[PDB]
Amino acid sequence: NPITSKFDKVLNASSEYGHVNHEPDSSKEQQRNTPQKSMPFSDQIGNYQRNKGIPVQSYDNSKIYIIGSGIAGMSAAYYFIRDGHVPAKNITFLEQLHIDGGSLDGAGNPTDGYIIREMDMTYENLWDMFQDIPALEMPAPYSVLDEYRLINDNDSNYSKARLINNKGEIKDFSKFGLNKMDQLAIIRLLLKNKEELDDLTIEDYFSESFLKSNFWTFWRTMFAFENWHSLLELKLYMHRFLHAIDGLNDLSSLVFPKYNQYDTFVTPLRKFLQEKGVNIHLNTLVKDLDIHINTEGKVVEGIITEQDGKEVKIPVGKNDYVIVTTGSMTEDTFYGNNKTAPIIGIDNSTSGQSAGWKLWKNLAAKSEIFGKPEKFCSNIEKSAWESATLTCKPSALIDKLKEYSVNDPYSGKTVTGGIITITDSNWLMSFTCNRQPHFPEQPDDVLVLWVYALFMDKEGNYIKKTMLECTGDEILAELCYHLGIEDQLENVQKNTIVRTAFMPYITSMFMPRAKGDRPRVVPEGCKNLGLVGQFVETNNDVVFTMESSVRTARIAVYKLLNLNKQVPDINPLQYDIRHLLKAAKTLNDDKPFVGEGLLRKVLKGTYFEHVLPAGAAEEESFIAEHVNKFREWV
Amino acid sequence: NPITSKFDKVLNASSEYGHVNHEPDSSKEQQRNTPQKSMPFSDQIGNYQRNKGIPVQSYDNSKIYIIGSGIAGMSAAYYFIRDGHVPAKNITFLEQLHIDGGSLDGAGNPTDGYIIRGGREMDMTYENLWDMFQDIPALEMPAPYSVLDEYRLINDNDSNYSKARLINNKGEIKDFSKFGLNKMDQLAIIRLLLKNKEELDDLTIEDYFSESFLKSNFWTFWRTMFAFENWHSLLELKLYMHRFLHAIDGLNDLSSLVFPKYNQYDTFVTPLRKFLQEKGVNIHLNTLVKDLDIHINTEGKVVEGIITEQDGKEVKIPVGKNDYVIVTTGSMTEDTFYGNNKTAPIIGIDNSTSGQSAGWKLWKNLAAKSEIFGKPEKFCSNIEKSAWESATLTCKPSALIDKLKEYSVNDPYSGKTVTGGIITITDSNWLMSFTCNRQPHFPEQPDDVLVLWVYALFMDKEGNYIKKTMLECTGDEILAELCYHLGIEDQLENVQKNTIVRTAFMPYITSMFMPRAKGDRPRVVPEGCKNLGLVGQFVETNNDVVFTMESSVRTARIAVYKLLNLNKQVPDINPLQYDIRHLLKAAKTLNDDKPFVGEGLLRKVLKGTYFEHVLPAGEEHESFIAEHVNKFREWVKGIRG
Numbered sequence A: 001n002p003i004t005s006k007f008d009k010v011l012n013a014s015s016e017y018g019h020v021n022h023e024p025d026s027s028k029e030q031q032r033n034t035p036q037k038s039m040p041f042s043d044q045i046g047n048y049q050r051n052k053g054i055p056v057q058s059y060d061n062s063k064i065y066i067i068g069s070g071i072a073g074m075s076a077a078y079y080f081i082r083d084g085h086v087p088a089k090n091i092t093f094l095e096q097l098h099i100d101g102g103s104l105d106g107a108g109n110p111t112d113g114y115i116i117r118e119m120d121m122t123y124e125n126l127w128d129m130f131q132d133i134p135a136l137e138m139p140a141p142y143s144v145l146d147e148y149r150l151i152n153d154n155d156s157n158y159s160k161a162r163l164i165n166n167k168g169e170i171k172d173f174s175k176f177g178l179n180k181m182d183q184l185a186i187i188r189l190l191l192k193n194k195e196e197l198d199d200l201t202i203e204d205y206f207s208e209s210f211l212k213s214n215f216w217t218f219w220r221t222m223f224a225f226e227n228w229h230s231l232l233e234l235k236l237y238m239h240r241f242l243h244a245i246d247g248l249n250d251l252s253s254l255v256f257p258k259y260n261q262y263d264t265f266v267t268p269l270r271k272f273l274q275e276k277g278v279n280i281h282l283n284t285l286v287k288d289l290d291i292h293i294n295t296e297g298k299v300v301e302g303i304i305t306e307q308d309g310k311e312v313k314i315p316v317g318k319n320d321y322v323i324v325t326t327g328s329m330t331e332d333t334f335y336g337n338n339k340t341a342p343i344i345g346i347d348n349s350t351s352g353q354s355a356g357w358k359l360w361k362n363l364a365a366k367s368e369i370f371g372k373p374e375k376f377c378s379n380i381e382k383s384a385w386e387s388a389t390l391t392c393k394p395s396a397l398i399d400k401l402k403e404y405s406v407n408d409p410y411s412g413k414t415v416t417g418g419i420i421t422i423t424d425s426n427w428l429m430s431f432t433c434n435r436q437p438h439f440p441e442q443p444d445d446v447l448v449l450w451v452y453a454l455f456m457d458k459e460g461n462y463i464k465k466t467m468l469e470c471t472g473d474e475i476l477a478e479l480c481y482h483l484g485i486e487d488q489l490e491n492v493q494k495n496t497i498v499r500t501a502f503m504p505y506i507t508s509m510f511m512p513r514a515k516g517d518r519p520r521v522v523p524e525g526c527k528n529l530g531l532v533g534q535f536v537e538t539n540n541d542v543v544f545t546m547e548s549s550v551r552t553a554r555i556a557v558y559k560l561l562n563l564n565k566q567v568p569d570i571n572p573l574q575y576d577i578r579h580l581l582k583a584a585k586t587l588n589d590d591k592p593f594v595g596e597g598l599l600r601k602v603l604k605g606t607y608f609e610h611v612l613p614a615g616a617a618e619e620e621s622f623i624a625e626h627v628n629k630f631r632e633w634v
Numbered sequence B: 001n002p003i004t005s006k007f008d009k010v011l012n013a014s015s016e017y018g019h020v021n022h023e024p025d026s027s028k029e030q031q032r033n034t035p036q037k038s039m040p041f042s043d044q045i046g047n048y049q050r051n052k053g054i055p056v057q058s059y060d061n062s063k064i065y066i067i068g069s070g071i072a073g074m075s076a077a078y079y080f081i082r083d084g085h086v087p088a089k090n091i092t093f094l095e096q097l098h099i100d101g102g103s104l105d106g107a108g109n110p111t112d113g114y115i116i117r118g119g120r121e122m123d124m125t126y127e128n129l130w131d132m133f134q135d136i137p138a139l140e141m142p143a144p145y146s147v148l149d150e151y152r153l154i155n156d157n158d159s160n161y162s163k164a165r166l167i168n169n170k171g172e173i174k175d176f177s178k179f180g181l182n183k184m185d186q187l188a189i190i191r192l193l194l195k196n197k198e199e200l201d202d203l204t205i206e207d208y209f210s211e212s213f214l215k216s217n218f219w220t221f222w223r224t225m226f227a228f229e230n231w232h233s234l235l236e237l238k239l240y241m242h243r244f245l246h247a248i249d250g251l252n253d254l255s256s257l258v259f260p261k262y263n264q265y266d267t268f269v270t271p272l273r274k275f276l277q278e279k280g281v282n283i284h285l286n287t288l289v290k291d292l293d294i295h296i297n298t299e300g301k302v303v304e305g306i307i308t309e310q311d312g313k314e315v316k317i318p319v320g321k322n323d324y325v326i327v328t329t330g331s332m333t334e335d336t337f338y339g340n341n342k343t344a345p346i347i348g349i350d351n352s353t354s355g356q357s358a359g360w361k362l363w364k365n366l367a368a369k370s371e372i373f374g375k376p377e378k379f380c381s382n383i384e385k386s387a388w389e390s391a392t393l394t395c396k397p398s399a400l401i402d403k404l405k406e407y408s409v410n411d412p413y414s415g416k417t418v419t420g421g422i423i424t425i426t427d428s429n430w431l432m433s434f435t436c437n438r439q440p441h442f443p444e445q446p447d448d449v450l451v452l453w454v455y456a457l458f459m460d461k462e463g464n465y466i467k468k469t470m471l472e473c474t475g476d477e478i479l480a481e482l483c484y485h486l487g488i489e490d491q492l493e494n495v496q497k498n499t500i501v502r503t504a505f506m507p508y509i510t511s512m513f514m515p516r517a518k519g520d521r522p523r524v525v526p527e528g529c530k531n532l533g534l535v536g537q538f539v540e541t542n543n544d545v546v547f548t549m550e551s552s553v554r555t556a557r558i559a560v561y562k563l564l565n566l567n568k569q570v571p572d573i574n575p576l577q578y579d580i581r582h583l584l585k586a587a588k589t590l591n592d593d594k595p596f597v598g599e600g601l602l603r604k605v606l607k608g609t610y611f612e613h614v615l616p617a618g619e620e621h622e623s624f625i626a627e628h629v630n631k632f633r634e635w636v637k638g639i640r641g
């Protein structure tokens, strides 16, 4: 290796070398400094993790096919280039739909109506990439991270009207409303081993009181969880975003890109990849892979496609690699507009038949290590909801909107601060106005609001139809009803372009799963295939995030090429005592939790007083009882 | 602003723009997610912090003068260029000595002998150092690889650890498996942690810790790998504990460390110099800066000139309305006296005129202008307290190397970890330690030569075999005392003919650890200063410790970011002390890996759960829980007491 020549004496005598664990597991690692340890801890994020890849061989004669060009696949290419030193020209995207980007869309225009189908700072893998990706609206040497922080540093995000009911009156959202039994259920969930929860659903575990709580109203709307989704995934979210728990009620835990995610993240990434010399196919349908299995392992040696109307097989040489974004969330989307309801063209009998789902189904046929696609896409009634993009000119809508806004909508600063959930709406309907303009070329008198509902089988309060039955102007009617401007519905409809989208696989990611149902990024025996997206398995990260897309991509690269590089686990902020205690206090609506009073007497006046959370707690009396309550809990 | 153009609407209605806290204090922050928050928490390290500076004006007309070409001065240059967009042309260094680099020296040759005044033990928590060096061209790897890359190429594939941390009785390995802290001495450590930083003014270490503590293997470990003397700052020791709480369990075998492939001049300094020279920064060697010209009026402090001693003459370098000045207000390697095999270092000062060397005069002069520039005399007024000596052994094959090979984790000539760090001769009168890092230690070091490093902590003690104080000894004599404790004193002649020795007496090596009080160290940019920044090991930061390279890079970034009022922050130290996993591990370690109070209770709760791995390494019934609870409540009770 002409890269490592001055180290060959050491590298050859190394036992670590080439046997790297590219995906360390923080949920199993007992962190100790021993003679064995030569690598950082499994979640030791920081600048020390900013070293680059060292390929052990040339990849000049190696081709790379990437099926699907969401962030997940473009991420794989970036790292193959950066860490594998694979020539960019050797990489080919075979795209399914032929607007790149996937679930991150910026479709539409002011005339026809825009159409769209939330992050925090712990998106660690995302920003490992985007800090070296050229900015949209800043000159060199500035990056996407730079402009992201240029606007988020100087305009805090928060809500002042998180919850409304009674035709527009602001509902109180200062408290979670969790009783003791439910606070215990959350805690026991955090303690439960991950492998013990196969196929269990949220409503299987949590009480009715929990499900009626503000906490769950907060969590279910902002994250898009349904009562029948995966218990495990919810648990993972809590571990993942524990530090954030005190800013859920007012969405102060969040930050947002200047524009829509397509224009902010997808375009600059694609543009960057297009500059180094990457190839893109916008007319190749991938239906299956040609995999050869034997005693040794699994090798992809061909890609079965449908170009035009014929079936063309792309050969995959022994030295080539393949990346697959195995599932789709936006597939089979059925749109609608103002005068038009979406005519849904499938039921649970035809669900799972589509370009994207079929490819995974064909993989599963080959070997059981490719997962169980049918568990995710076999119940549209459970994995669907409908979003509506509002293109708005001055209206009674915008009038009422300004009452809910933090800054003036047209100001370019934070507006609604995130979704505004209509508590007493039958659909469980939420809407949001992000920073305007949401689109770079948006007109100065146009606002783009976004709407969303969680119950697909309930008749609205005002419009006595289910949401998928409604026209654009009818959802406005249902919206206007809950905003007390029903009596001005005409002014709104004549000035608001509505484009709806019914997505049957939008929460298929969250469906109850069991062991082996999701493949690993690089399944047993696979020498040259990688699986990335919201449907492959990572150690502890969550899904329905761009972070998982990037996380899975990096794993693919490093594991396939056997690089020296790791992908650290999720940000260890849950282990931070400050966020543990903050969480405990917040779950309890600032009531004194157990041991707090004691903990206050000991730390107040010390170095660690700042560790104590916000609120007020006072202090063998009844210690004999908590002993025997805690003694019985275990 | 042509950078900001696309954001003017929002920025001109922002409450935060131009009011960033460039040095957030994690020691005071009640971390909460509130409407008021837009920045990350004070110590939220990671990639989100990898954004860049956005200067609000041009600096093409702005000259920047940097006194001191050490890792702190070069760092200020790097960040001025990186985040200030300051033309590298516009930057000039002014150095006192013959060569660039400062305390990270790496001179000498196989014929005269090498000389390293010292080595660099490190951790992965050096966030600012690595925020910089991750973008600095590698020495021994081609483009596009960084110093960070070649650093990890060697350290990822070769663990550092020791199998002979303590030796005594003329060669024998002392058992170094335990800390040996007792009930009371442990608790005294706990309390120090809990004490507010503001209450420890002028307190020394021996002022606070028992004699048992000071004889514990813990303190033997700590005092030798951190160069602490019993008469040093209590606050500093505490700061260290907070800083390196996560490393406490790998101190006894030094498994908590990583080392640069070479001396830090070749590994760190030279790559960075090369980088800055190429962009076009200027340097002036052998130039002594005696004093600054600061104009102080009703509205602030402004540097307006630099008074220099170039050669023998005195020259005054003017400083303009638009110019900036960065000062390294003290060097721990100031006024070194060198010796060798046949010569003891002939000490040209001793207490009577301790502190009247140059380099101190600049800080001394500055302190005369305003109390806000601190009190240098608290640091350079006692050579007997601030000094010790190191020796550099350039070794051909000899009975010394043969003995060394028994202490070595890997064969000395291999290129892997050798001693694993310092080996401390427990019962040496000088309290002498010695190390052998990965060899070669210099890029051009011969195949049959090894470089060994030796230092001692007691300067006023007659040796065990040579009945003199260390600074009285010739290089040959230091070899005698050393050979005695290794058991080779009967082959001293062989060792002497095959080992070149260069010693370095450093009168102010540990001057940074001297006890201090409120105001004794100036802030990086003192109150009123519009164009002066102060960097290095003698200036004030929120929580970081001194005698590290990390602090020098830390202070440099604070300098740039405050002086230019940038959008950029300097996060506090890595928050591993708040990691419940390192908390519990510390407690268990401080108790010789026997169960600490409370652990049993905790183990009843987390064992068999998602959080089992949190429990440290080393089960009674439900009936005894009411006991464990009361004995726990009783323990926290007596903590304050």
Ligand SMILES: Cc1cc2nc3c(=O)[nH]c(=O)nc-3n(C[C@H](O)[C@H](O)[C@H](O)COP(=O)(O)OP(=O)(O)OC[C@H]3O[C@@H](n4cnc5c(N)ncnc54)[C@H](O)[C@@H]3O)c2cc1C
Residues within 6 Å of the ligand: B067, B068, B069, B070, B071, B072, B073, B094, B095, B096, B097, B101, B102, B103, B104, B117, B118, B119, B120, B121, B122, B287, B288, B289, B290, B328, B329, B330, B331, B332, B333, B358, B359, B360, B362, B390, B535, B536, B537, B546, B547, B548, B549, B550, B552
């Ligand atoms: C022997 C030794 C062992 C060490 N061990 C470790 C270790 O194991 N691990 C670790 O992390 N760190 C260690 N350190 C610390 C590390 O080397 C230093 O903290 C770091 O290099 C700080 O450098 P600096 O830029 O702050 O100042 P220095 O490098 O001390 O000074 C830089 C230069 O500024 C010059 N200067 C000062 N005043 C003036 C003036 N008025 N005019 C002109 N020039 C001036 C000086 O001549 C000096 O050469 C060690 C240091 C030494 C000396």
Ligand code: NA
Residues within 6 Å of the ligand: A246, A247, A248, A249, A250, B033
């Ligand atoms: Na709150």
Ligand code: NA
Residues within 6 Å of the ligand: A033, B249, B250, B251, B252, B253
């Ligand atoms: Na140990």
